[PDB]
Structure 1
């Protein structure tokens, strides 16, 4: 129905945060960009790294905000606003605590589930939570108090490997995601085991 025009990968900028769990979405987009031979240009006008490629007569943009996670909306709103991109033409890839490593799922609208990145985006878009999300599982520490230190940590090798597998499964369903066919995108994706 509605073709995706923007794909966002969430994460924190800087060496200190590079390769940490909270940067899954960014990793996804980065892998996507490479696979597509798309260059990510540093553009201060959108507060992040921007990329573009064509698909079916339309321009699809890739974005990795270089703001901190809790101010990512500024980045998204900035680009979506400049190109008049509707919230439902937007896919945001992010880390998901509620699913274990190696699992990736799609979802349309809903809560931010406590993810400060998502929360800012909903807010900045004028309380639009209409957009779709690619949820890349990273696991849960076990307790609410440990969550903050857990997402800013680098996962052991076994876990990073499962995440790598899930991102690969996700790229596998790109055709369907780019087209906006979420029902087929979900069926092919959601029946994949790590």
Structure 2
């Protein structure tokens, strides 16, 4: 029903955070941009890297915020506000503790689950949580005390590859996602196995 006009990939900026688990969303958008031949331009006005492509006669934008994760909403609100994009036309890709590496799922709305990127977006969008999420499994360390070090760590080879695989799976349902056919996207996606 509602075409996606903005795809956001969450991550922390800088060499220290590059390739860490918490940057799974940004990796997805990087991959997507490369596959679609889209340049990601550093644009201070949107506090991030912004790309654009055309699909079915509409501009679709790609955003990787270059705020810290906990201020990602500032970036999403700037770009969405400027182009008058409603939450229902936004997809946010992010790392998900509650699914293992190799699993990707889609979800509309819900809470943030302790993810400070998602939390700031919900807050900045005038407390609207009804955007869509691409949830990219990164596994869970096994206790709450270990979570912060875990998401800011670099995963071993095996887990990284599994993430790459889930990103591949998600890119396979891009047509459905872009069209806003979440029902069909979920059917195709939630039946894949790494």
Query: Equivalents in 1 of 2:158, 2:41: separation in Å?
Result: 32
Shift of 1:30: 0.2
Q: Deviations over 1:14-64 (max 9, x none)?
A: 000000000000000000000000000000000000000000110000000
Shift of 1:82: 0.1
* 3-state secondary structure, aligned to 1:51: strand
Query: Equivalents in 2 of 1:114, 1:164: separation in Å?
Result: 24
Query: Equivalents in 2 of 1:158, 1:180: separation in Å?
Result: 32
Shift of 1:92: 0.1
Q: Deviations over 1:54-103 (max 9, x none)?
A: 00110000000000000000000000000000000000000000000000
Q: Deviations over 1:123-157 (max 9, x none)?
A: 00000001000000000000000000000000000
* 3-state secondary structure, aligned to 1:64: strand
Gaps of 5+ in 1: none
- Report 1:17-166 matches (<5 A): 17-166=17-166
Query: Equivalents in 2 of 1:38, 1:116: separation in Å?
Result: 27
* 3-state secondary structure, aligned to 1:134: strand
* 3-state secondary structure, aligned to 1:162: helix
Query: Equivalents in 1 of 2:114, 2:153: separation in Å?
Result: 18
Shift of 1:184: 0.1
Shift of 1:160: 0.3
Q: TM-score, normalised by structure 1?
A: 1.00
Query: Equivalents in 1 of 2:7, 2:79: separation in Å?
Result: 11
Query: Equivalents in 1 of 2:24, 2:61: separation in Å?
Result: 18
RMSD across aligned positions (CA): 0.3
Query: Equivalents in 1 of 2:115, 2:16: separation in Å?
Result: 20
* 3-state secondary structure, aligned to 2:18: coil
